Amino acid sequence: SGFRKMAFPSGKVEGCMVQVTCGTTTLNGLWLDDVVYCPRHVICTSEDMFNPNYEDLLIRKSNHNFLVQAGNVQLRVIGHSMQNCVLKLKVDTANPKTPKYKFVRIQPGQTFSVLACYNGSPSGVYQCAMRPNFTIKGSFLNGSCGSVGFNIDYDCVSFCYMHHMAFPTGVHAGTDLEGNFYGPFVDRQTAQAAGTDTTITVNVLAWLYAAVINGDRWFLNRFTTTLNDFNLVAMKYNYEPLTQDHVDILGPLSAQTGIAVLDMCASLKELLQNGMNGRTILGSALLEDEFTPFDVVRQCSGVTFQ
Amino acid sequence: SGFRKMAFPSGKVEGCMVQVTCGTTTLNGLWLDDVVYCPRHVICTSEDMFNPNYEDLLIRKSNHNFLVQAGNVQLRVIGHSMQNCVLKLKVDTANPKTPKYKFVRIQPGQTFSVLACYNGSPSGVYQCAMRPNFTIKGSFLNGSCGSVGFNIDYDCVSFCYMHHMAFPTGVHAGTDLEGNFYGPFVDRQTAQAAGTDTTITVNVLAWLYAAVINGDRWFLNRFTTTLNDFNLVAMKYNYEPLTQDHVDILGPLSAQTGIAVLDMCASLKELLQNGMNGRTILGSALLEDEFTPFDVVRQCSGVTFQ
After folding, report:
1. Which A residues in the span 176-215 are in contact with B, Cβ-Cβ below 8 Å?
2. Changing residue 49 to A: what effect (chains A, B)?
3. Three-state DSSP class for A102?
4. I need a labelling partner for B43 at 20 to 30 A (CA). Which of A87, A277, B95, B174 fits?
């Protein structure tokens, strides 16, 4: 009953967030086993921000230049290294609340929970999709740098995102946990613009499948289409290409509802040309693209995370 | 930067959720100190729900007729009583993860976060408003009863909602933690429905303020209106009447942006009368009413030009 942009429970990740200070900069880090991960821009200053020389800044740093705090407990830094745009501080204590975890680099269209933090202290949680243009539509205030995005699959926490930069554009950008940025962005405080964004077609379809499971079925029609003819309409309304791979990923939902994917594609073709005509779908007056096929299944199945 | 619906982190509340079983019904409980709170409908059979005498039904129950499990830890029930529509199971063990907390009866138009649970285990988290018709737009399947809603102020969790039942329109109803329903609803199986879904005018206005602060201003017009003329339009479109209290609450946002509240109302008047004409505001094709003035200020706080 009902359908919401639903985040994962944050409890496992809250237990991993610490405060990291270097100079006058404080931001958040992720404490897993005996390593703390944070944005390397913690080692810049104001003077440096615009165009820092990270290699040089790091060489000149020693362990005592870093202050790491888990609540009030000071964690002693016993080693420092840089992996792409992420700083890794070795500490003397393994985090006893370390959940089983992996690091994954996510693909555009895939979603995750952002745990927004300030000064090592979790503040808020919301869902995001990695956009086609490699931005996210987040909400981040000062000191949110090092906030991470994650998925939970069984017991296992998969970290896919760490927040590095807010550009005066309104643009949010970050890295995987190996420090490689999503998109062409760099950790330099300068105007950087995203390429133009597109709608995530496969997700739109997943969400129409969610509509049907919840008994909102007015948009369904008798028409059908080929993939190629659909993609000729995809590209006109600024939609990502629907691959054959996508069509097959929408199999489980097609079976559970007994509506064929290409039919649902036909129903989508019609909603694009004709608009909604004052109507809504699952309480929205536009086509939602930030729910994946897994997301729909998760929410409609009531999966839990222990 | 940016603007998103955000829930509070769920970790403190996850530590409080347990599983309660009575007869063939399993649902969630809230474990704080040595008391477990749950919907009193857990004591009933399907047949009992048609015409339940709760006092009678409870007398026939003993402590061993309630099975409480916190994860795998069984908790001995040593007392039971009922406060309005909530069951209170005294147990022999105080919850070691009990946070600082209060019980609060929330006002309509105000927001809270929901941790949806099943079998005393967390499934996900999302933010709701207490709507004027005293329903909430949740996401709740079978087994979700006893899920709670809350706000965190510092380290103090203020619990305000416990989930009891679902309406066919995809909305949900429940009690405070003293067991008093929000709205005219009852925990028996009789004919019931949500009143008209009145829109929270003050929140829509706040959200239009967020919109302009996020650079989306197409809907501003030169016009102004009076309280009375606006309220005539509000009555026609099922919006709450604007009050002087609402005008005053929007004071900060008005002052920051330099747009008088009654000027913003005139902008809202046109949107209601003419609709959106295909356009979006903050990436929505309808007027959002689940952000309070407070929620907006927290994400849209800025400078005022002097």
Report:
1. 214
2. Does not affect ability to cleave and inactivate human TRMT1
3. strand
4. B95
